[PDB]
Design a protein around this motif. Sequence first.
Motif, PDB file in Angstrom:
ATOM      1  N   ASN A 244      11.674   8.108  13.600  1.00 52.53           N
ATOM      2  CA  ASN A 244      11.436   9.529  13.357  1.00 52.53           C
ATOM      3  C   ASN A 244      10.101   9.950  13.904  1.00 52.53           C
ATOM      4  O   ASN A 244       9.972  11.034  14.464  1.00 52.53           O
ATOM      5  N   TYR A 247      10.051  10.106  17.748  1.00 60.94           N
ATOM      6  CA  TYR A 247      10.807  11.285  18.205  1.00 60.94           C
ATOM      7  C   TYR A 247      10.085  12.598  17.951  1.00 60.94           C
ATOM      8  O   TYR A 247      10.067  13.470  18.814  1.00 60.94           O
ATOM      9  N   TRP A 251       9.704  15.220  21.082  1.00 62.49           N
ATOM     10  CA  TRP A 251      10.263  16.550  20.927  1.00 62.49           C
ATOM     11  C   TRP A 251       9.225  17.628  21.000  1.00 62.49           C
ATOM     12  O   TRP A 251       9.502  18.709  21.500  1.00 62.49           O
ATOM     13  N   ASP A 269      14.019  16.201  23.747  1.00 60.64           N
ATOM     14  CA  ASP A 269      14.770  17.403  23.438  1.00 60.64           C
ATOM     15  C   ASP A 269      15.310  17.288  22.012  1.00 60.64           C
ATOM     16  O   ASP A 269      16.203  16.480  21.745  1.00 60.64           O
ATOM     17  N   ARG A 270      14.757  18.088  21.100  1.00 58.88           N
ATOM     18  CA  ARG A 270      15.180  18.080  19.696  1.00 58.88           C
ATOM     19  C   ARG A 270      16.549  18.724  19.496  1.00 58.88           C
ATOM     20  O   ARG A 270      17.086  18.700  18.393  1.00 58.88           O
ATOM     21  N   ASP A 271      17.099  19.313  20.563  1.00 53.69           N
ATOM     22  CA  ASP A 271      18.428  19.928  20.522  1.00 53.69           C
ATOM     23  C   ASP A 271      19.482  18.901  20.918  1.00 53.69           C
ATOM     24  O   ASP A 271      20.672  19.204  20.979  1.00 53.69           O
ATOM     25  N   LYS A 272      19.040  17.676  21.173  1.00 52.87           N
ATOM     26  CA  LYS A 272      19.958  16.608  21.540  1.00 52.87           C
ATOM     27  C   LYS A 272      19.905  15.429  20.543  1.00 52.87           C
ATOM     28  O   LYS A 272      20.260  14.299  20.884  1.00 52.87           O
ATOM     29  N   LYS A 273      19.491  15.727  19.309  1.00 51.64           N
ATOM     30  CA  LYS A 273      19.349  14.774  18.179  1.00 51.64           C
ATOM     31  C   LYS A 273      20.415  13.702  17.888  1.00 51.64           C
ATOM     32  O   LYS A 273      20.079  12.608  17.433  1.00 51.64           O
ATOM     33  N   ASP A 274      21.693  14.024  18.062  1.00 52.55           N
ATOM     34  CA  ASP A 274      22.763  13.042  17.818  1.00 52.55           C
ATOM     35  C   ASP A 274      22.729  11.883  18.815  1.00 52.55           C
ATOM     36  O   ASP A 274      23.055  10.748  18.460  1.00 52.55           O
ATOM     37  N   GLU A 275      22.323  12.180  20.051  1.00 51.39           N
ATOM     38  CA  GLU A 275      22.207  11.187  21.114  1.00 51.39           C
ATOM     39  C   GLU A 275      21.129  10.107  20.820  1.00 51.39           C
ATOM     40  O   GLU A 275      21.071   9.088  21.499  1.00 51.39           O
ATOM     41  N   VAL A 276      20.313  10.318  19.789  1.00 55.94           N
ATOM     42  CA  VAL A 276      19.234   9.381  19.396  1.00 55.94           C
ATOM     43  C   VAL A 276      19.615   7.897  19.152  1.00 55.94           C
ATOM     44  O   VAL A 276      19.011   6.991  19.742  1.00 55.94           O
TER      45      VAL A 276
END
Length: 324
Positions: A244, A247, A251, A269-276
Amino acid sequence: HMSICTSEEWQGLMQFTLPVRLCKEIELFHFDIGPFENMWPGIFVYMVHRSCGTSCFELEKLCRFIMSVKKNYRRVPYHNWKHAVTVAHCMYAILQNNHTLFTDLERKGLLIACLCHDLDHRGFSNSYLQKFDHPLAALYSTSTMEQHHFSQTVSILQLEGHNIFSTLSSSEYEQVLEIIRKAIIATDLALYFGNRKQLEEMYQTGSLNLNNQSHRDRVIGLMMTACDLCSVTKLWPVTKLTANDIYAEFWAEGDEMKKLGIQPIPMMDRDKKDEVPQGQLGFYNAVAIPCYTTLTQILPPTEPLLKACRDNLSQWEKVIRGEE
Ligand SMILES: Cc1cc(C)n2nc(CCc3cc(O)n4nc5ncccc5c4n3)nc2n1
Ligand SMILES: [Mg+2]
Ligand SMILES: [Zn+2]
């Protein structure tokens, strides 16, 4: 332009002693410094002492150095004071488990190096700072931040009453500073991939020689990298957490790109969170596992580091497979 600690700060550190219940655990590779913020500077001194003996540096001088080093770490989410101590601890645990492979000078150099390795990190990447066009990219242009970090250390060392390396001969002084410089540059992740390939090669042909200085520098470098990433070697809830933090930084960088109408790569990119979790798996596989794997080959006592990495890896897999 450097920052000094106060007498309050450094004298309280002189007085500190480690709780006996911590002594055992400090020696474990998976040990987590996270609960004991309070004691972090104390812990480094302990580790220095247990590594280098109780009068390797003049205690009054050591404390001034540590506490100032602390002051020149920014309050960013990941490349902060805590990162520095975590990395320093891991080096401590590597050094202890390989004691006679390394010189007195090396062990002082490296513990100090790790403590200093990301001094005055702004939370922006080397890419960024060059990729559009920070005054620090204007000064150095390969491994920008690192050459800054090293500079910082030196600036801190050259402070009044701060030079812990003073009572060495100017040969040995001029030698450890080399050890510290190379070790800090090593931490530029760009450089890691080259270093690992060579080391991979050399081990495999049976030509890696710890008596060869340049081979020596490389192992150290790998050690640095192995320590730099060690968050990936803590027990799962610790590691999850750290993620966390890393990231949060990326971000924030991506936001600053977005603010100037530039698409940041997906990592920041915090709009791509699931890809983490898929991001992690990739990182373990391409970078982490390879790193520790080669270090366990060279330095078999460092095996638990590899073991812990594997265990974390499978957690990430399980997250991707929908079981967490
Ligand atoms: C402790 C530690 C130290 C370092 C240097 N890193 N670097 C990384 C980045 C991993 C990564 C790579 C990547 O290409 N993507 N793409 C992604 N898209 C989406 C989400 C995450 C992504 C991602 N994540 N994680 C680290 N953890
Ligand atoms: Mg760094
Ligand atoms: Zn670092």
